[PDB]
């Protein structure tokens, strides 16, 4: 069996991206944020505090004839901005563009932060790193994918990013016309739970490939790219005016500014992210300064290879027993 949903951005700046996924029998509509960077699939719910709900779409499963619920379980997240949520579980039917999967663990929100709460357009998030970094307590759930992988023709999802426009999320099979060229594999480390590798390089515009290892995580669920100091600052210096406002939270530079694009290394192949796309956005509409695509991971403690980055290329999440990631030009 297969998958094809499309994936749209929230807002006109690509901050987040939203796919609809059907829970429950008859069929709820959510709009999940899906992320390869976290593991569990949370939804806001009939049990999430009324204060904390504002325009979100809820889950209800007393409304479902399939949702069970997991009995004993709760789940409690921290994501890497600060963000939060918890609550218990349920088991219910859940398909992603045609691709069904039972038995699903869907972790209903009780409590949100206020990021999730502001943020009218996305109803939860579909974590798509591997199972081991799943919240639910005591018995850790899997993942959407990892349950749908064995009824799936090959064991693999692809993001299709857009630029300020809708793009794809496939689970079993790869669109041969959704690329340029050919997909690079490269080796995954599933050691922190996430998909892991190491990047052969980088380039700023026209400038020489520089061959360097960048270890980091191919992160769906991450607005921005984020890598070392060194290679953020190389970027920026070609940018006049560019600087680090501590006031905003990293580099900015003049909405006047054309961007150099920005070349990852994947083994000996290239990946060219455009100079618009590091061009994310200004700070205030009207604004004289425009945030940075490129940021600095240093106040982090890994590489964060986010949208980015990612929309730029027909991302391959191998989840075969000795998982890869391969990426393609588009």
């Known amino acids: 069996s297969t998958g094809s949903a499309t994936t ?3 807002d006109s700046l690509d901050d987040a991206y939203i796919t609809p996924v059907q829970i429950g029998t008859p069929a709820q509509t959510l709009n999940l944020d899906f992320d390869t960077g976290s593991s569990d699939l949370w939804v806001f719910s009939s049990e999430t505090t009324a204060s904390e709900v504002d325009g979100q779409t809820i ?6 004839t399939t949702a069970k619920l997991l009995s004993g379980a709760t789940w409690s997240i921290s994501y890497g901005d600060g963000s939060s949520s918890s609550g218990d579980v349920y088991t219910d039917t859940v398909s992603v563009g045609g691709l069904t999967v039972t038995g699903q663990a869907v972790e209903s929100a009780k409590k ?23 919240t639910v307590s005591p018995t850790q759930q899997k993942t959407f994918f990892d349950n749908a992988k064995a009824s799936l023709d090959s064991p693999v999802f692809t993001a299709d990013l857009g630029y300020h426009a809708p793009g794809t999320y496939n689970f079993g099979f790869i669109d041969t016309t959704a690329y340029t060229g050919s997909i690079t594999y490269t080796a995954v480390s599933t050691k922190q739970g996430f998909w892991e ?16 290892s960048i270890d980091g995580i191919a992160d769906t669920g991450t607005t921005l790219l984020y890598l070392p100091a060194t290679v953020v600052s190389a970027y920026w210096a070609q940018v006049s005016g560019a600087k680090s406002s501590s006031s905003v939270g990293g580099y900015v530079f003049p909405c006047s500014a054309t961007l150099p694009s920005f070349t990852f290394g994947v083994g000996s192949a290239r990946i060219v992210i455009p100079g618009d796309y590091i061009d994310f956005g200004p700070i205030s509409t009207g604004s004289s300064s425009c945030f940075g695509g490129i940021q600095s991971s240093a106040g982090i403690g890994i590489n ?27």
């Open 8 to 10: 749209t951005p929230i």
């Open 59 to 64: 889950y209800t499963p007393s409304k479902s």
């Open 112 to 134: 949100v932060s206020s990021s999730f709460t502001e943020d009218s357009t996305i109803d939860g998030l579909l974590g798509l790193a591997f199972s081991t970094l799943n």
């Open 197 to 212: 590798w190491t990047s052969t390089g980088y380039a700023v515009g026209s400038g020489t490939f520089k061959s360097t």
């Open 304 to 330: 964060i290879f986010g949208d980015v980055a990612l929309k730029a290329a027909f991302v391959v999440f191998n989840g075969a027993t000795t998982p890869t990631l391969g990426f393609a030009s588009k």
